[PDB]
Design a protein around this nucleic acid. Structure first.
Ligand SMILES: COC(=O)[C@H]1[C@@H](O)[C@@]2(O)c3c(OC)cc(O[C@@H]4O[C@@H]([C@H](O)CO)CO[C@H]4OC)cc3O[C@@]2(c2ccc(OC)cc2)[C@@H]1c1ccccc1
Ligand SMILES: Nc1ncnc2c1ncn2[C@@H]1O[C@H](COP(=O)(O)OP(=O)(O)NP(=O)(O)O)[C@@H](O)[C@H]1O
Ligand SMILES: [Mg+2]
Length: 373
RNA sequence: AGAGAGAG
């Protein structure tokens, strides 16, 4: 445990970028994981939502970069285009002063423009989503020759059944000596088993499941009775609220579109976000929510992981998540870096089992919503 | 399953 960025043997010009970004003291995960990452160990880093995992790996990557080698030295993957873009902006701002280059390799962007930029000069760090990154590797416009660090953010999503093969196909193009770093708020037992295909006696920084939920996010439930409409329950509640910014999670794209329309039909101002929209529209919606121009986003799990909007203080689970790990991530959209937030769960009878599994596994208190608001 | 995840 190192409690000061000055105590981490970081180059002075990386420190200029850290302090310019506004950080003053390292968070708990930063105090524990930056040094092992810099030293080149494989690291599994679990830590509570919103406590600074991004800068943990960005700082470690930037300290390792050989700036005058104009070649890609580090590859970071994320499960969604929005998260990859967010991560890219953090690395680029931390690395700006020292002159590290960081390029986003994500789907839905002009390929010719990207290929020309890569042809101009290989960026030091690539942050991307797996499909586009593997495409660029396969076309040979991205070279793995000097990649010595491979970071999976949201690692347990990236190593799930639907992604692990994409990750493994990219991993095949990397040198055997590549350092591997995995970070997530959740690290379930099945994923930790999978990590042996990727990693060599790694350092494990884990959180006890009964201590994972954030103290500052008050969790509540509302029972929806059999004859009641969940839509009325949300609208009645939504009226009695003064929102700064809020996220409402829905399990399907179809239902996001439907709910957005219903809410507009009751003169509520919301915007919708999901993965079947054009990337230009996704970018606009995200930008307007980050800036505070729209106050309430209705979304799928596209935005459950990693997305950081400080002003979000309210999460509503209109549908409960289909796996318990996404519960942690969804409610973690509020309460970023020690702010107090609220999460509200709508619970129909068929939802009780799901919510019960969440409560007992994480040993967390979910209380009946009071009238205080 | 859902949700994500290249190009054309
Ligand atoms: C089991 O096979 C796979 O894992 C493959 C396929 O799944 C794959 O083709 C694949 C998709 O299939 C429907 C969809 C996909 O995203 C969706 O659809 C995109 C397009 O619309 C659909 O093509 C648009 O964006 C996404 O919606 C927004 C990415 C993707 O990448 C793949 C791929 C295949 C070849 C390739 O270079 C030759 C690059 C990517 C997977 C892959 C394989 C290795 C490494 C990473 C990813
Ligand atoms: N040392 C720090 N001091 C102050 N703010 C910080 C520090 N590190 C990170 N932050 C901010 O805390 C917020 C959360 O950081 P982020 O890296 O997104 O968290 P995370 O641990 O990855 N959360 P998640 O992916 O949802 O599990 C961002 O606004 C960061 O700028
Ligand atoms: Mg994160």
């Amino acid at each position: 445990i190192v409690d000061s960025f000055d105590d981490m043997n970081l180059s002075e010009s990386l420190l200029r970028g850290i302090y310019a970004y506004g950080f003053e003291k390292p968070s708990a995960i930063q105090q524990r994981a930056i040094l092992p990452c810099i030293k080149g160990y494989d690291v599994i880093a679990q830590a509570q939502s919103g406590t600074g995992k991004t800068a943990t790996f960005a700082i470690s990557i930037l300290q390792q970069i050989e700036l005058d080698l104009k070649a890609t030295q580090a590859l970071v993957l994320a499960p969604t285009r929005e998260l990859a873009q967010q991560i890219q902006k953090v690395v680029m701002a931390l690395g700006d002063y020292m002159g590290a280059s960081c390029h986003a390799c994500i789907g839905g962007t002009n390929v010719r423009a990207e290929v020309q930029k890569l042809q101009m000069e290989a960026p030091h760090i690539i942050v991307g989503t797996p499909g586009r990154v593997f495409d660029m590797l396969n076309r040979r416009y991205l070279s793995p020759k000097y990649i010595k660090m491979f970071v999976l953010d949201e690692a347990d999503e990236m190593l799930s059944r639907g992604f692990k093969d994409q990750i493994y196909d990219i991993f095949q193009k990397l040198n055997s000596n590549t350092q591997v770093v995995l970070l997530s708020a959740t690290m379930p037992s099945d994923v930790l088993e999978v990590t042996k295909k990727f990693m060599r006696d790694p350092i494990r920084i884990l959180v006890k499941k009964e201590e994972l939920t954030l103290e500052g996010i008050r969790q509540f439930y509302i029972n929806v009775e059999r004859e009641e409409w969940k839509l009325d329950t949300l609208c009645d509640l939504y009226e009695t609220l003064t929102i700064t910014q809020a996220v409402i999670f829905i399990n399907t794209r179809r239902k996001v579109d439907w709910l957005t329309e219903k809410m507009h039909a009751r003169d509520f101002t919301v915007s919708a976000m999901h993965g079947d929209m054009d990337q230009k529209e996704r970018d606009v919606i995200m930008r307007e929510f980050r800036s505070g121009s729209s106050r309430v986003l209705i979304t799928t799990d596209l935005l459950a992981r990693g997305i950081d909007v400080q002003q979000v203080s309210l999460v509503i689970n209109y549908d409960l998540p289909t796996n318990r790990e996404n519960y942690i991530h969804r409610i973690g959209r509020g309460g970023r870096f020690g702010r107090k937030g609220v999460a509200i769960n709508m619970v129909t009878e068929e939802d009780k089992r799901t919510l019960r599994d969440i409560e007992t596994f994480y040993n967390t208190s979910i209380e009946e919503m009071p009238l205080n608001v």
